[PDB]
């Protein structure tokens, strides 16, 4: 059909803002609305990644999951010109993202919210008093490790200050710093983990995960015991051995039914949410590549 | 005397009427007329195989603004689509002449394992019988007839024993899809396949290739399980399994639904799972993973199965064929 | 240009190169000297032989 949007800007653009902008003439962008006439508002992620309010990872994933993505194609001060990304077609995307990861033919690119420093994901347009923020695009296997390692870095870095003698930060850094993949080694730039809670964009997700893991074994056994009938899964009775002696010791009588069901329900909510998160909802396949051209045929 | 104040209907009616025409469908035929031209117009699919001359290029219309060639090469308006027609995307493979047997069936889909050498320029692909070769009167005879000296394959992945014990063999391997064209050379063969689209032949002489799987591996999930309706699409899967014999590769096909398919899988594997996990070896951490599944695409149902007997070196092989398959590869899912 | 091949090798599409060459500028100087007595008697009409 026709797929294109021209976004007008308020004022003209300063020079070193135009060249800086040109440097990303092949990357992806999260839109606001599906119309061929839009302001600059709702085009990056600062709409949900501003500097005033605290960044929430989950708040950004809940927006990337349900939005429209597009590719830049022309940038010339007075207006930008992009093209939507709707299924049923093949687009051509040019890899340029400051923390750089070498792509391979026949992979599956995953758009993940920026976890690295802000300057490697954002571009400011001060002529218009607007920052545009770009989502991070990694090959699915890589993101699979980069999201677990950073999250465990959060945990360790918090608990070591909470309790000194639990571990050594040096065991944390040399372990989690490097991520290696497919005959390639990559070195993470870690976010230095500021102390107080809530001001870590991973703090919320770490809370979700840890509360889930603290609540799991209490409800697991109860759910196991209640199930058994004359006719049930053989495999259930089988795995009923696997659980440690410790958990099978827990007595359901001690917990009150109100609190018990509270744990049950909140834990199930946390599971249903968290497991969905890991799937890396916006994911797109790769068919071809060029290392010298930085071109990937994706869809 | 009114000084023009905007774009006018001219240059607008032209653009819009050409943008306008909708596809024809539901033409009425009368047994009196019984045949017409517009009937043919509805009929023709407009295949694109242009034949190398300048004027013929345009006549075929392979030179057309739309990704699909349109009639006459963009002169007419068109129908802005063809029932969601997406030209199949193709994958170009360069395979060592030893790993792949040229006499293989063309319908057979392919699998490539991820090699981990710096800047790998030659890759190693695997077909079902080949994977059966690696992981070690039935298949075995026909396989050993097709592939000899399995070390010629085993040296491709110098990590096989490590991955089978590490239960990570499933995650590396990516399927691609069915075979399309084949050129045979002494050193490195030229092979090309298709991913994410209708399975089709690219040869100038037209041929309709149908995906094939040998009968020992393929297991119809809906066959052995038995109101229920029959929908249009029927989906095919691969499943990898680490049994105490070894990694054992099979197949699965049904329309029953994903959440349902994972469940039927458990009841299917349960007795095998029991002895696998039983007294023989208790278990560590990584070892717990047992198998993995993937979705292989859509195949119109009620078409069902024919069984084609493949011939090689004076021996018969029983093989099932599924027609008009549409390639759509999905990722891997643990089953336990 | 390119060549057609039988292998499945990734095909190089149409290519094209653009190169720019620029100029260089060069300077030359010299100095000569003359006395004032010499330059002055170029101005005056001579009286005697």
Indicate which of B52, B91, B92 best probes the interface with C, i.e. most C CBs within 10 Å of its own CB: B92
On the CB side of A239, CA atoms within 13 Å amount to: 13
Going by DSSP bridges, is the β-strand pair B333-334/B291-300 parallel, antiparallel, or unpaired? antiparallel
Q: Quick one: closest CA in B to A299, which residue?
A: B196
Kindly state the helix (H) or strand (E) to which residue B269 belongs, with its residue range. helix B258-277
What b-and-e string marks burial along B260-273, b requiring 16 or more CB atoms within 10 Å of the CB?
A: ebeebbeebbeebb
Are B274 and A238 an interchain contact pair (Cβ–Cβ within 8 Å)?
A: yes
- Which chains have at least 3 CB atom pairs separated by less than 8 Å from chain C? B
Q: Count, in order, helices (H) and strands (E) of chain A.
A: 9, 14
Beta carbon pairs, A and B, within 8 Å: 36
Q: Which helix (H) or strand (E) holds C25?
A: none
Give the separation between CA B64 and CA B80, rounded to whole angstroms.
12
| Distance (Å, whole) CA B299 – CA B309 | 21
Quick count: other Cβ atoms within 10 Å of Cβ A203?
Answer: 19
Method: cryo-EM
Rounded Cα distance, B292 and B238, in Å = 8
- Exposed (0-12), middle (13-18) or buried (19+): which is B44, by Cβ within 10 Å? exposed
Decide if A211 contacts A270 (C-beta within 8 A).
yes
- From chain B residues 148-167, the ones with a CB under 8 A of any chain A CB are none
Q: Which DSSP letter does residue C45 get?
A: P
Q: Are B268 and B239 in contact (CB under 8 A)?
A: no
Edge-to-edge strands, sheet with B188-195? B89-96, B188-195, B174-183, B109-112, B125-126
Structure tokens given for B59: 């006549």
Sign of CA dihedral A137, A143, A149, A155: positive
Contact B164, B154 (CB under 8 A): no
B195 touches chain A (CB under 8 A): yes
For residue A143, the SS3 value is helix
Contact between chains at A285 and B196 (C-beta distance less than 8 A): yes
Contact between B270 and A235 under an 8 Å Cβ cutoff? The reply is yes
Q: Is A106 on the interface with B (CB under 8 A)?
A: yes
Find chains touching chain B: ≥3 CB pairs under 8 Å.
Answer: A, C
* Structural contact between residues A68 and A215, judged by C-beta atoms closer than 8 angstroms: no
CB B305 within 8 A of CB B322: yes
Give the DSSP letter string of B37-64: HHHHHHH--------SSHHHHHHHT-S-
CA of B123 to nearest chain C CA: how many angstroms apart? 12
From residue B197, alpha-carbon distances to A202, B178, B301, B324, B329 in Å are 40, 11, 17, 10, 10
Cα–Cα distance for residue pair B291/B239, rounded to 1 Å: 7
């Amino acid at each position: 059909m026709d797929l294109k949007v021209v976004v007008s800007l308020s004022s003209r653009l300063y020079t070193d803002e135009i060249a800086k902008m040109q440097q990303r003439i092949g990357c992806i962008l999260p839109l606001a609305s599906t119309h061929g006439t839009q302001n600059v508002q709702g085009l990056g992620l600062g709409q949900v990644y501003s500097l005033e309010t605290v960044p929430d990872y989950v708040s950004m994933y809940n927006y990337l999951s349900d939005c429209t993505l597009a590719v830049l194609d022309e940038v010339s001060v007075d207006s930008l010109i992009l093209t939507k990304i709707v299924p049923g077609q093949t687009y051509a995307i040019k890899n340029k993202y400051q923390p750089f990861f070498q792509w391979h033919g026949t992979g599956s690119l995953s758009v993940m919210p920026p976890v690295f420093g802000r300057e490697h994901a954002t571009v400011k347009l001060e002529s218009n008093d607007v920052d545009i923020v770009f989502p991070m695009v990694l090959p699915t296997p890589i993101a699979e490790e980069v999201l677990q390692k950073i999250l465990l870095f959060n945990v360790y870095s918090r608990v070591v200050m909470q309790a000194p003698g639990n571990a050594d930060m040096l065991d944390v850094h040399m372990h989690l710093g490097s991520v290696s993949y497919l005959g390639h080694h990559y070195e993470l730039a870690l976010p230095e983990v500021p102390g107080p809670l809530g001001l870590a964009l991973l703090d919320n997700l770490s809370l979700y995960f840890c509360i889930m893991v603290t609540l799991l074994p209490r409800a697991s056994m109860r759910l196991v015991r209640g199930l058994i009938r004359h006719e049930h899964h053989d495999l259930l009775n089988l795995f009923q051995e696997m659980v440690p002696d410790e958990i099978a010791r827990i007595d359901l009588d001690d917990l009150s039914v109100a609190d018990d069901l509270s744990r049950m329900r909140v834990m199930m909510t946390y599971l249903q949410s968290l497991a969905s998160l890991f799937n890396l909802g916006p994911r797109l396949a790769t068919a071809a590549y060029s290392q010298e051209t930085l071109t990937a045929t994706c869809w | 005397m009114k000084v023009q104040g905007s774009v006018d209907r001219r240059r607008l009616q032209r653009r819009i009427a050409g943008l306008l025409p909708p596809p024809a469908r539901r033409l009425n035929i009368s047994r009196g007329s019984e045949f017409t031209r517009d009937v043919r117009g509805l009929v023709e699919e407009h295949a694109q195989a242009s034949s190398l001359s300048a004027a013929a290029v345009w006549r075929a219309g392979l030179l057309a603004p739309g990704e699909v060639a349109v009639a006459g090469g963009g002169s007419g308006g068109g129908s802005f689509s063809w029932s969601g027609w997406r030209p199949p995307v193709f994958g170009d493979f360069l395979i060592h002449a030893s790993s792949f047997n040229n006499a293989e069936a063309t319908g057979t889909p392919l699998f490539q394992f991820k090699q981990s050498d710096p800047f790998s320029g030659v890759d190693a692909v695997f077909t079902p019988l080949s994977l059966f070769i690696l992981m070690n009167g039935g298949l075995t005879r026909m396989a050993n007839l097709l592939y000899d000296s399995p070390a010629t394959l085993a040296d491709l992945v110098p990590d096989f024993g490590r991955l089978v014990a590490d239960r990570r063999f499933h995650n590396f391997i990516t399927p691609v899809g069915p075979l399309v064209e084949n050129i045979k050379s002494t050193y490195l063969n030229k092979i090309t396949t298709v991913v994410h689209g209708p399975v089709v032949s690219k040869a100038i002489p037209r041929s309709t290739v149908k995906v094939t799987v040998p009968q020992e591996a393929f297991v119809d999930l809906d066959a052995w399980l038995s109101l229920q309706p029959c929908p249009a699409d029927a989906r095919l899967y691969v499943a990898l399994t680490y049994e105490e014999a070894g990694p054992r590769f099979t197949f699965f096909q049904s329309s029953r639904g994903h959440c349902q398919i994972m469940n039927i899988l458990r009841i299917y594997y349960s007795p095998s799972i029991m002895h696998r996990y039983a007294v023989v070896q208790p278990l560590h951490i990584e070892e717990l993973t047992f198998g993995a599944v993937a979705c292989l695409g859509t195949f119109s149902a009620t078409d069902g199965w024919r069984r084609s007997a493949f011939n090689y070196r004076g021996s018969s092989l029983p093989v099932v064929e599924i027609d008009s398959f549409y390639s759509n590869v999905s990722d891997w899912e643990v089953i336990l | 240009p390119t060549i057609a091949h039988g292998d499945g090798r990734r095909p190089s599409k149409q290519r094209t190169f653009i190169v720019v060459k620029n100029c260089h500028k060069h300077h030359i100087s010299t100095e000569m000297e003359l006395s004032m007595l010499d330059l002055e008697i170029l101005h005056s009409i001579p009286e005697t032989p």
